[PDB]
Design brief:
Structural class: mainly beta
Number of domains: 1
Keywords: Hemoglobin, Staphylococcus aureus, Hemoglobin binding protein, protein-protein interaction, Shr, heme acquisition, metal binding protein
Shape: globular
Bound molecules: bromide ion
Subcellular location: Cell membrane
PDB class: metal binding protein
Protein name: Streptococcal hemoprotein receptor
Order of helices and strands: EEHEEEEEEEE
Largest sheet: 5 strands, mixed
Number of helices: 1
Helix content: under 10%
Distance between the termini: 13 Å
Radius of gyration: 13 Å
Strand order of the largest sheet: 1-2-7-6-5
Strand content: over 45%
Organism: Streptococcus pyogenes serotype M1
Number of strands: 10
Length: 116
């Protein structure tokens, strides 16, 4: 149901970080997914690749050696839905909760096939 390789986040100033979304990974699936990101949405807002800029307080993302940085501009109280599209991988949906200024990791999945 949940991804094994994306499990956590860090809080930054006006941003969060997914350290496991690593463009330098020896894990070829994580490396190819991260290198080949095509689109990031937060609560349906389209984010811009800021390349190497601070993402503080932006609708912006950066992939670098510390992971995937996301601005919190489009974040809301309660549930937040982050959708990462990539060339070779089904969309990844990360759910995070915001409460009293604090954001925590809830789930990371790709849409699943129903099995018995
Ligand atoms: Br599938």
């Amino acid at each position: 149901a949940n991804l094994s390789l994306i499990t956590k986040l860090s809080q930054e100033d006006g941003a969060i970080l997914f350290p496991e979304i690593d463009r330098y990974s020896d894990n070829k699936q994580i490396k190819a997914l991260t290198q080949q990101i095509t689109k990031v949405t937060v609560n349906g807002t389209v984010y811009k690749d800021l390349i190497s800029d601070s993402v503080k307080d932006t609708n912006g993302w950066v992939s670098n050696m510390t992971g995937l940085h996301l601005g919190t501009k489009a974040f809301k109280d309660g549930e937040n839905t982050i959708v990462i599209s990539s060339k070779g991988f089904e969309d990844v949906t990360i759910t995070v909760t915001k409460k009293d200024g604090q954001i925590h990791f809830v789930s990371a999945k790709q849409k699943q096939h129903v099995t018995a």
